[PDB]
Symmetry: D2
Subunit: 101 residues, 4 copies
């Protein structure tokens, strides 16, 4: 399950798998995807994790709001880093692998 | 509150403000920051928005988990895009502004 | 040659092909890859496109320097944008296609 | 010249300075900007570093072509990585500094 390209890593991420690069050397890091959802207008007022300016703007829309899926990283520090992005090096790399489990 | 550089936009984003580029022409788009949080190990099992493989891995850690703040975009489509990233063009741009409210 | 995923776009980019997303609507934009090269230490002093601080640092290395391949965009404005990066939306998109030629 | 925010790092990069994060621990890495240029249509055929499909497309334009400035990284491996991008962590970090020289 190794020597994968970025595209293969991405297809595994969309399947809820965890992936990593060999070149990230034994630091326990991996990437994963968090699913999207559509939040009903009725539910939206209960969301804690939006700035008030944004929450007000969206409630004024008075409609259900779609939140997109996105990639996240479990860092060398053991934090969940929201919104992981692929460097040029990562996108072109041939050393990706799928973590077991 | 216009003709700002990316750095100024970023400092406004950390203040929970919404920011945008003039060069994004009247499509209603803006960037905002979602706050970080530390989730107690006791709370973590209740999280819906993590893949099961990741949720299991983290619960096995048996510790509180930090989730980082991250930038998000309200898109031209009216979706909340999690994990917005700055293109070269955005990082070097001098046409940022802070949205009122 | 359509309805491609990002991974397929990336494999085409590594083949020197030009690729684009349907969702970028008829603005003539495409992505391409610029090749890497290793520049001999003897050649390096002739490079115009490096800041002097960086050029001095590298010449002091007194060794050949590898420059990585990277993705670039031909923009809606008709500029070559060096160092194009894939948004969350792009990485997860299923509407990529290879441009003819 | 330390404890800088990303915006301050970016303003230094536009001045042709080299910048880095404390959290990148003594691996010699830094970021720098490569200048943009406008290449005359007459010069463009001589460019080695463009795929043939792209070079042909641009020459058919029969006009001068602008190439944008972009950020680059001198990596832990000692390679010049073209098209460096700022992670969420980097954009929000308060540990940037300007390298001397
Ligand atoms: N700062 C921070 N806190 C986090 C993070 N992940 C989880 N939490 C906290 O855990 C609570 C429950 O998360 P949930 O079960 O996914 O429950 C979430 C989830 O089901 C949904 N939701 C909110 N935003 C999104 C989103 O962007 N995508 C998806 N798919 N669902 C979302 O709304 C529910 C309630 O959201 P909240 O009120 O924010 O309530 C969240 C928030 O307080 C994170 O990355 N950062
Ligand atoms: N600002 C700017 N100018 C551009 C750009 N593309 C081409 N040029 C200009 O065109 C000259 C010739 O480019 P080349 O044929 O690729 O000739 C290049 C190429 O063969 C090589 N080289 C330099 N940097 C790189 C790199 O990052 N990657 C690769 N593969 N080759 C490089 O060194 C040769 C001489 O480089 P320069 O002295 O810089 O000379 C460059 C530079 O003045 C661009 O995106 N931005």
């Amino acid at each position: 399950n190794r020597k994968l390209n970025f595209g293969q890593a991405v297809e595994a991420l969309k399947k809820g798998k965890r992936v990593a690069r060999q070149g990230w050397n034994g630091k326990g890091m991996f990437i994963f995807q968090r699913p999207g959802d559509e939040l009903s207008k009725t539910f939206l007022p209960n969301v804690k994790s939006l700035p008030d300016a944004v929450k007000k703007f969206l409630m004024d829309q008075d409609r259900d709001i779609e939140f997109t899926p996105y990639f996240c990283m479990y860092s060398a520090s053991g934090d969940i880093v929201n919104g992981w992005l692929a460097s040029q090096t990562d996108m072109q790399a041939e050393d990706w692998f799928v973590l077991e489990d």
